[PDB]
Design a protein around this ligand. Structure first.
Ligand SMILES: [Zn+2]
Ligand SMILES: [Zn+2]
Ligand SMILES: [Zn+2]
Ligand SMILES: [Zn+2]
Ligand SMILES: [Zn+2]
Lengths: 362, 78, 362, 362, 362, 362
């Protein structure tokens, strides 16, 4: 005869839904019956068939609620509250530990019985990705720890390279591999405050294509990207607690999370370059282009730019003695599954086709 | 080129240093004979009205200033 | 039954949490059981195992509250209210007195049994920091009092120096040593009002890297930093009660707190320089660079830029007759602990390696 | 059991607290016990030990209130409401009458038994202040009445003088002597509306350092100060009811209060100068500089820029026949106290040291 | 028992208070006792001693109300609602009829027993005002009707004249004589919408000193005044229902009221001048200056710029056959009072001293 | 003892009041008594004496309501809701059908017994209006249908003509003849969104005097009018559902209604002219000027720019076979009234005086 808020909040803490309308719709699907729900039998969304029977009782009354958006609203705040806390208690290495596990959770489903993901294609992506930069997997481990160590004025990395090379492909996958959001600074420093407020309680930021006055002869349009970066020195250093705003009333005043800044061969001030760590010049390789011309599954199923892809690359090359001691037991698990499905011959055979310019899976 | 008694007279209206046109112009010479600005002159002048105890200003007390304090330290006659 | 607001407000006044979502999440961790709480046994956060048994009763019902964000909201206002009052009653010297004690409280935990902080490394930072500027500790005492005396048009200090020298490293530590926030003026004078409203009830402000039209030949990008500073004359003087805005409706109209303004060799107007007190030209020293190359613990554990670091430097050099009479008894306490762990030989031996260009702890 | 709003509102009307969070914190200190309150025995804040026993009963329940910010909120509105009314009923001379009395109230405490203010130092400030401009006290009386008479296009005064002279020192003290707020126009005409809305129900305004295009050869940075002043002709005249905005929804449409405009030798349009009354060119005097070099108590305890300082100067020189007939009885009171502590010799002896360049109290 | 809203609303409709905080404070003065109220006996404000006994019963409980600002809030809306209606039902001539009567109501009090206004001084102002422009009284009647007739692209008048002449003195008095508000366009076209929304349900607008690019050689600062005027063609014509905004949510979409535009000899586009009706070039007369030099009562008591002053000038010269037939009976009333106190000799004797350059009352 | 909302909403749906404060005041006039209401006997406003007895019962209690603005608020939403629906169901021709009838409703009152409108003057306006442009009535029918047909990139008409010619006179009348609102684009593209959101659920838009860079030699001030028009290509075409915002939260995403764009001989880009349909160059005729010089009733009573005027012109010339079949019966009604009062001689006799330059009614 009354709706339960603790249950809705519970479901929220589970799916970690930090959205209002999203959390509302998802919960409004349990006000029917899991008795004949197609989505429950077909095993489509783990956030449905795994929580319907758990919240079917409350959702039944939730439908006749006059505060459907209010109940879910408080849940969202509880979700953001959790992250608000974890960003202070758990070390930057533990935060990743949880991420790496959540990334594997999806894998245990997609690469299982209720999954439609083909491990062969994702293993092929690990090949293309390793053929993108010298010792790609090696660099990934360095970036990861670089994010963990968190060294002032020694955090952001530079993905400076021409158009179409792999920047937006890697800078994106890394975002999901570690966790966080991708911002933009091409817009005036007006809405910059309304966008920089997304890095709150995050792990890392991703600045996509920053426009600068430099490169006026290379047909490179100028903007405010490079400029804005310099107008955010402390933000790049992280030695001080910058100010952030979330929905009018201030929500945080913490240390601006590190990250990656991408660009297309624009000019970079010395006072700006001194805020970076490493500069990775992406090279527009042809064999990579011809490679995807016969490997649509990488661009279609989003593999070359998936965080799950890099995870497979971290478990394939990097030893177990490098991961968290609480996850080392899970790393070995897939080191057996991957070596079982693919040996060392079938693997390099894929990187081989990459060198040729043909399908990775040929 | 003088020192404009109007710039030195101001300091005389602050401490209540009554001085007619003839008296104020008498200090203008002190600003040209030594180079002491209107601000440093009035500052050193009243310190002469304490060493001799004289809370009054005539043409004698203002004259003995160039023979007691400034006379033993002329910087434009060495 | 019923949820208690005075208890939540009490916990808020304790941790001095001036955040809404943060105060919410932290309190939502006491709705379980301190009986087996790992965070309570492991002694991770003093704001947890020290207040769970104290608020376990209310938090238990807090979970089933329909106003979880409302209850914590009022608490936040009570927190800001406290600071709102202290900024008027307690003298500027007493405000620091409390800060210095809170800084030592963390030390009594990290340098104790339930702490993972190594006093050796922090003592090493005091060495590197003293090798940053001539009579560093001496300057710190001057700045402190300079902030206490609060002299109109004689408050802000200038940290003008080339890229990578120690500006952002000191200007940051000082911020935590005294207390306050760090602002930025590189952004248009539009959102300037939404950022300058952070110095409310604060102690000092920190302007990080101000861009000016000057230095166009030194590859120094121009901006609005220097300009904005001049567009805030009264703000720099403090002889008048400037206007501030916090979340739409005005929250304060007080005297703009003093602080520090940093820059990278930009041109400075005479009408602006006349608003400062002292100009510290930071020199990019090599031996300092090579020093950190073998002392990662300073950059990792954040020591060279920690307020706690400067505190150790103030207790090591400066006598007890300079601190507050209500804290002089605590200053002598650490003057015995530090001299017990490190003599005068082991100390200078660290500053020695600094001169060399090797690890401070060698 | 129930909280009283009339009591909180009463306390608000007493301290005239026009702040929300401030009024909240101050009232939250009476929910303990005046039985052992240190602030009540030490006699620190007249707004504490004088009202605790009066509001101890309500504050006791105020703590367990779910609307701590709401109760105090209404009180604030009642406070602003009072000023909103007085700005229309009481003549501009009566408004000052009340101010002059409130300024003396502080004096009766600081210069009493429960005060830590030394009358000797404040009397010394009256000396330095009188050595700032020819017939300083005389000018003060003229400005006061100039504000009372309120003559259209004949209200604002000009404090045009070089850097470091006494402008910001006097323009500030006068603000507290009469009452009101100090605004700024160096910022774009965008937030100008959000700042000009402070002069609501005020008495006078103080424009600190206005930047103009003039003086480009005198190393004087140009801005929008002078320009904005001209973009506010009616605002300067006061013959029409200008529009003002306070927190989104308009709060007033009255006559813009007179005031003082300060600057540093910038160029001034004739159409702008015709909106002023008198131009006071502040002269950077040396003896004044050397004076404060041996009189730190003036800059520390804020005396040379205190409204209470000018009050002592008005009671020392100006006769009783010039004050309000309802305050003439109080003016004579201090004319006996001041003449009792300091004769005419000890007074001029201080102005004497000013002429020298030594401590006023030597 | 319970607070009455109809009573508060009634008082609001009486004083026509369109303010929230103002209406609140005024009503909070009846929660005491009219038994010994000084303001009730001294007859200071007609909005007090005339309504205290009427609202003493409700105000007594109003004090213990938890919605003091809410009750008065609704009243304000009822006030604006009244004007919102009158601006559509009553003809533009009837609206003035009510104004002229309200202006006389003040006179019946100030020029009565409970008034401190001297009719001699106000009659002197009528002399100075008539010596400001050729057939001043004659022009006033034309402007009045010009506002009544309301002829598209034939409404606004131009008060173009040098600095200090009488523009701001007349353009102000006229505003009160007819009714309305005075706006400004010197500010960017950004806040223009937040200021133009004041002419809602008004009668006429007053643009004070509009800055234009013209007159660059006459030391006349340029701005956006003239430009903004042209950017508001339809606003000046009034043949279409322009859009207006009051406090976020739109409050009106009516015909922009006519008015007067003042300036200081700036250049005026032909497309702009074609939106005016008559151009009155104010001449900076000397005898007028010397006149006020011996007639401070005009500038002090605000007479030369008072709407009540022009009213006396309309009743002195203009016949009764020109006023509304419902007010003609009241016009004759003062035509007897004025002719009783002052004949034709004493009147012209004042305009005589104006010609001389001495006090109007000599 | 309860207030009815359905009744207030009913009255709202009747008068179609889409205003909040307006709907409030109008309804607050029925809380007295229609027994002696002067406005009810005099027959002044059809929205009063026709609904007082209908809502006297509820309005009586409405006065003692604590939500006077809330009750009327919901009514407004119901009003906008109606239009929100009609703009989708009723064809663009039916929408006009209702408008034409509402325009005649006013006529049946003003041209009746309870009306003060003289049919002679309005018939004279039809003469002046027909002497404004060749086959004026003919053009009106074309525009009407042009609005009905609604042809993409073939909707807006151009009223390009010199100052004072009849543009603002016709573009205004047409607005009322069909229905809708008149916007402006001279203001920055900033508040453009807050103004373009008025065309929501409307029929047509009216852009008054658009300023362009062209015509710099013809003393024509440049602006952003012409530019903004080009910055709204899709808005002019109407082949896509543009975005609109009403009071913060979006209220509509429909097809931008057609309309008319007026200007004063400014330059027009080819890419802009291609968005129009017909260009009507208004000629500043003298005989029209001299005509109004003896026909003040047209400018006073607003006839030459009234939608009711054009209606009379549509019923006089255009046959009945052109109107809606549901209104054809009403068109013939006035075709008998007009021909009864005025023959063909008295009509052309008016257009005759127009040719002369004398009063249309001579
Ligand atoms: Zn299901
Ligand atoms: Zn615990
Ligand atoms: Zn106490
Ligand atoms: Zn009374
Ligand atoms: Zn009626």
């Amino acid at each position: 005869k009354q709706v339960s808020w603790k249950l809705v909040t519970e479901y929220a803490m589970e799916t970690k839904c930090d959205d209002v309308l999203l959390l509302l719709g998802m919960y409004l699907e349990f006000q029917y019956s899991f008795e004949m729900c197609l989505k429950c039998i077909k095993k489509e969304q783990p956030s449905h068939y795994k929580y319907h029977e758990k919240h079917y009782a409350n959702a039944a009354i939730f439908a006749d609620s006059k505060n459907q958006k209010t109940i879910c609203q408080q849940a969202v705040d509880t979700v953001l509250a959790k992250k608000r806390v974890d960003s202070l208690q758990l070390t930057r290495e533990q935060m990743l530990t949880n991420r790496f596990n959540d990334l594997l959770d999806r894998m245990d489903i997609m690469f299982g019985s209720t999954g439609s993901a083909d491990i062969e294609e994702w293993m092929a992506g690990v090949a293309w990705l390793h053929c993108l930069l010298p010792k790609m997997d090696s660099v990934v481990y360095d970036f990861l720890k670089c994010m963990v160590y968190n060294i002032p004025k020694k955090r952001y990395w530079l993905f400076k390279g021409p158009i179409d090379s792999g920047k937006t492909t890697l800078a994106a996958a890394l975002l999901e591999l570690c966790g966080g959001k991708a911002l933009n600074v091409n817009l005036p420093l007006d809405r910059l405050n309304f966008e920089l407020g997304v890095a709150i309680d995050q792990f890392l930021v991703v600045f996509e294509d920053v426009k600068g006055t430099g490169g006026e002869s290379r047909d490179l349009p100028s903007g405010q990207g490079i400029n804005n970066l310099d107008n955010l020195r402390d933000y790049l250093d992280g030695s001080v607690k910058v100010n952030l705003e979330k929905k009018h009333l201030n929500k945080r005043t913490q240390i601006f999370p590190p990250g990656i800044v991408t660009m297309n061969e624009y000019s970079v001030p010395k006072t700006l370059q001194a805020r970076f760590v490493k500069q990775i010049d992406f090279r527009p390789k042809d064999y990579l282009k011809h490679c995807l011309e016969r490997s649509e599954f990488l661009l279609e199923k989003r593999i070359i730019q998936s965080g799950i892809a890099l995870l497979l690359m971290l478990i394939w090359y990097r030893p177990v003695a490098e991961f968290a001691q609480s996850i080392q037991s899970r790393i070995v698990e897939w080191k057996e599954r991957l070596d079982k499905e693919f040996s060392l011959s079938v693997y390099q055979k894929m990187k081989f086709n990459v060198a040729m310019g043909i399908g990775v899976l040929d | 080129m003088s020192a404009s008694a109007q710039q030195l007279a101001e300091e005389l209206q602050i401490f209540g240093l009554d001085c007619e046109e003839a008296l104020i112009e008498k200090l203008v010479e002190l600003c040209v004979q030594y180079g002491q600005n209107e601000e440093g002159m009035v500052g050193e002048l009243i310190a002469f009205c304490t060493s001799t105890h004289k809370v009054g200003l005539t043409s004698e007390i203002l004259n003995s200033f160039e023979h007691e304090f400034l006379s033993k330290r002329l910087s434009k006659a060495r």
